[PDB]
Design a protein around this ligand. Sequence first.
Ligand SMILES: CCNC(=N)NC(=O)Nc1c(C(C)C)cccc1C(C)C
Ligand SMILES: [Mg+2]
Ligand SMILES: [Mg+2]
Ligand SMILES: [Mg+2]
Length: 220
Amino acid sequence: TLVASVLPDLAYAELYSDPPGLTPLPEEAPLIARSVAKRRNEFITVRHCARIALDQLGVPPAPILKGDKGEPCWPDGMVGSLTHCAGYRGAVVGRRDAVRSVGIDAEPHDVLPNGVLDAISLPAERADMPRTMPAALHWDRILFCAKEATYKAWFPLTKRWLGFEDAHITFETDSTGWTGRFVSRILIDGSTLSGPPLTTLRGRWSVERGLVLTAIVLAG
Ligand SMILES: CCNC(=N)NC(=O)Nc1c(C(C)C)cccc1C(C)C
Ligand SMILES: [Mg+2]
Ligand SMILES: [Mg+2]
Ligand SMILES: [Mg+2]
């Protein structure tokens, strides 16, 4: 799988298309009743992936509903993250006793649309990241993906907004050239609903098959 290359009580599942036959669980069906086909397909497929991952940890097939801000609602004692983009649906789930939080993101490995890099990056990131990343890789898109995994790991623990300017992310590249590590440093107050405050979040990135994947797994 693609997500295994960005991961270190934890399970995952991913699909690259929307298989025929899959349906939402009855409890999930109202959430996409008036949604277009592209949205229903990604919603149904990513939650099938979530249930495949949850099954590996011994959780019965459960619906994945949404919270007030759209965040996924996991079964008791579980945490996880979902992502879907063109050609990718992915889920990573963990047991809360050992895994405090998970955040993952996937995006096509393409240059960012005009003007978006400046809206999602800090000046030091634009200056330093091209020097730590392999030539010709879309480091701007990889930066955006790391910001998204950071927010997805952050929000279940804080229930607070995190802006793109509120996290400074530094990168390293493995010897292979297409995978590496990152560290996201939270610049604002990192107080959480329970447990110690969030300061630095360590994650991994990977470019493979036209996709960028990022994941953060915070140990309990
Ligand atoms: C480092 C801080 N990152 C963020 N706040 N990211 C987002 O809000 N992404 C996002 C966005 C952004 C691009 C505005 C739109 C819809 C859904 C999402 C989810 C991933 C929550
Ligand atoms: Mg998506
Ligand atoms: Mg995303
Ligand atoms: Mg492509």
